[PDB]
Amino acid sequence: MTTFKLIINGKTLKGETTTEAVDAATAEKVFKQYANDNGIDGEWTYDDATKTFTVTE
Numbered sequence: 001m002t003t004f005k006l007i008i009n010g011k012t013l014k015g016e017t018t019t020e021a022v023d024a025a026t027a028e029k030v031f032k033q034y035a036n037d038n039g040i041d042g043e044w045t046y047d048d049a050t051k052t053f054t055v056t057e
Contacts, residue, residue, distance in 0.1 A: 002051060006031035009056035010040035028053060 001020045004027035008014045017034065021027035024046055031053050035041070042057035 002027065004031065005050070005052040006035065007052060007054045007056075008040065009054070010035070010038065010042060011057055012038050013040065024051070024053075027051075 002023050003018055004021055004024065006017050008016065017031070019027060019030050021030060028044075028046075035055055040055050040057045042055040045054045046052075047054060
């Protein structure tokens with residue numbers, strides 16, 4: 001599977017998290033539910049250099 005990583009540049013949390021998704025098509029569905037729950041609706045960006053969803057709120 002593709003291990004994606006979501007950064008936490010939000011005003012409620014901070015650090016890093018990982019998961020197990022076949023590709024960004026499923027990684028965002030899991031990372032989005034995580035950020036959407038806490039409240040990280042910053043500006044999402046997917047860095048292809050190392051596959052890592054980067055939001056910032």
